[PDB]
Design a protein around this nucleic acid. Structure first.
Ligand code: ZN
Ligand code: ZN
Length: 44
DNA sequence: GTCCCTGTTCGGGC
């Protein structure tokens, strides 16, 4: 399973989510890199 | 192919 980054809901991922998405790193906020890329404070 | 999975509009991959 998974949880959508663009909205939260399971079943799909952000790419599949037909919703308004963010510019930068979904988790931390910064843009200069992506959520996958980021290893700032990915505790939970 | 049921379950897994991520950077665009939009479900493809095994
Ligand atoms: Zn979503
Ligand atoms: Zn980040």
């Amino acid at each position: 399973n998974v949880k959508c980054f663009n909205c939260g809901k399971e079943g799909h991922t952000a790419r599949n989510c037909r919703a308004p998405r963010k510019k930068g790193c979904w988790k931390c906020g910064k843009e200069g890199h992506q959520m996958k890329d980021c290893t700032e404070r990915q505790a939970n």
